[PDB]
C-alpha cells in the first residue's frame, strides 16, 4: 500500500504479508498486505492488529483486530475499554476509533472497498520510544528499499510533463 510516515515521507510499498507499522514500548500495529491482483506488486491491507501494551494503573493489555468485512467496535475479548476511561473504542461507520488517552494515541480504522485504511496520531516522544532492536516500523522509517515501488522513468516523465 501507500505509506505516510511519522517523519512525513510518502512511499508505495509492496510489503506482502505481515509487517510492523509500529513496534514500540507502548503500542504494536501489525498489518497484513495482499496483492490487489495475483500478477501485481500493488498490495492492500486486509488485516490490522493493534496491541495496547499493558500500562500499570491505566489499562490491561488490549488487542484490536479488523479484517476486511469484519471491523468490530470492541477488542478481541468483546471488551470496549481498559481494565478506566484511559482506553476506549468508538464506532462511527465501516469506521472505528481507538482512544488511548493514557498515551495520547488515536487509531482510526476504515474499510475502503475490499481493503483497510489506517491512521495513527501519536506524540513524538512516545512514537520514538523504542529499543535499537525494534528497527522495522514502517510508520517510523518506511519500508525497506527492496519493498519500495520505483517507476523513476515514468514518475520522472510525469513530473516533467
Amino acid at each position: 500500500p501507500h505509506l505516510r510516515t511519522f517523519k512525513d515521507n510518502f512511499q508505495t510499498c509492496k510489503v506482502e504479508g505481515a509487517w510492523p507499522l509500529i513496534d514500540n514500548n507502548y503500542l504494536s500495529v501489525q498489518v497484513t498486505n495482499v496483492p490487489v491482483v495475483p500478477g501485481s506488486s500493488a498490495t492492500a491491507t486486509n488485516k490490522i492488529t493493534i496491541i495496547f501494551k499493558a500500562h500499570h494503573g491505566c489499562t490491561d493489555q488490549k488487542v484490536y483486530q479488523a479484517v476486511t468485512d469484519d471491523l468490530p467496535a470492541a477488542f478481541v475479548d468483546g471488551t470496549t475499554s481498559g481494565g478506566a476511561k484511559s482506553l476506549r473504542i468508538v464506532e462511527r461507520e465501516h469506521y472505528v476509533e481507538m482512544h488511548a488517552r493514557y498515551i495520547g494515541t488515536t487509531v482510526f480504522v476504515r474499510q475502503v472497498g475490499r481493503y483497510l485504511t489506517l491512521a495513527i496520531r501519536m506524540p513524538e516522544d512516545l512514537a520514538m520510544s523504542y529499543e535499537e532492536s525494534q528497527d522495522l516500523q514502517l510508520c517510523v522509517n518506511g519500508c525497506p528499499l527492496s519493498e519500495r515501488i520505483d517507476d523513476g522513468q515514468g514518475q520522472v516523465s510525469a513530473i516533467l510533463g
Partner: peptide, 14 residues
Amino acid sequence: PCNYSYLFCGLFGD
C-alpha cells in the same frame, strides 16, 4: 492522572 507535538501515520490501499 492516566491522561498523557503529535506525529501522524497512514496506510491506504494501492
